[PDB]
């Protein structure tokens, strides 16, 4: 069956983001006026939170754990689909084709993504999706 879906984590293997982890939010399997190929809208995190430890108190923890996200159209061929998953229903509205085209709507739509990700990093659900891939 089709393992590219709304929750499926992937890895970005092609360009400026190569090595970073994403989540496939709104896949278009076949067709579009532009992008005449199967592509998937994704959201991912560009900066990974730094090592946090017992010894860091006070303000370091909040400034180590800062996440920087992104939203991108990407071609399947540039993704490694993997078995992991996220619960994506938070921002399903906020990451969309309508968000692109009006780039103001893209920096409005990182906030609802940046907030959903720093939540999950508390309450350590999806421990792996927040750890820097290494290569």
């Amino acid at each position: 069956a089709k393992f590219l879906k709304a929750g499926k984590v992937a890895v970005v293997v092609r360009g400026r983001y190569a090595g970073k982890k994403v989540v496939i939010v709104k896949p278009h399997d076949e067709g579009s006026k532009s992008h005449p190929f199967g592509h998937a809208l994704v959201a991912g995190i560009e900066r990974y939170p730094l090592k946090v430890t017992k010894k860091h108190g006070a303000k370091k923890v909040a400034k180590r754990t800062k996440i920087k996200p992104f939203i991108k159209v990407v071609n399947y061929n540039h993704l490694l689909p993997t078995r992991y998953t996220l619960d994506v229903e938070a921002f399903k509205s906020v990451v969309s084709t309508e968000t692109f085209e009006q780039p103001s709507q893209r920096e409005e739509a990182k906030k609802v993504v940046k907030k959903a990700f720093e939540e999950r990093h508390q309450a350590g659900k999806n421990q792996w999706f927040f750890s820097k891939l290494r290569f």
Binding site: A1, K2, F3, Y76, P81, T82, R83
Partner: protein, 97 residues
């Protein structure tokens, strides 16, 4: 043997050839089986298996190089992986594979 299995799929059933055209059938879950050469590079095979365990498809290993696997599907060129997306009157799916 396996040759008669592959050889009967040709005119009775539909299939794809080569790496990049299996993954499009495999990422679409149209792949009912894949046959993978013995000389194929490890990191290639490792990835073809990983796509399979996600799409839950049977991975059968042809015994031979890619020079022989194309001799099996009746091609004059080498082929390193083959995906069977619809089987013909042959028994390939129901049997050992």
């Amino acid at each position: 043997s396996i040759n008669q299995k592959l050889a009967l799929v040709i005119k009775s059933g539909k299939y794809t050839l080569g790496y990049k055209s299996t993954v499009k059938s495999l990422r679409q879950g149209k792949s009912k089986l894949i046959i993978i050469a013995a000389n194929t590079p490890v990191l290639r095979k490792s990835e073809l298996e990983y796509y399979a365990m996600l799409s839950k498809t049977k991975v059968y290993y042809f015994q031979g190089g890619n020079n022989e696997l194309g001799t099996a599907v009746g091609k004059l060129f080498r082929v390193g992986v083959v995906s069977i997306l619809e089987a013909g009157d042959s028994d390939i799916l129901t049997t050992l594979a």
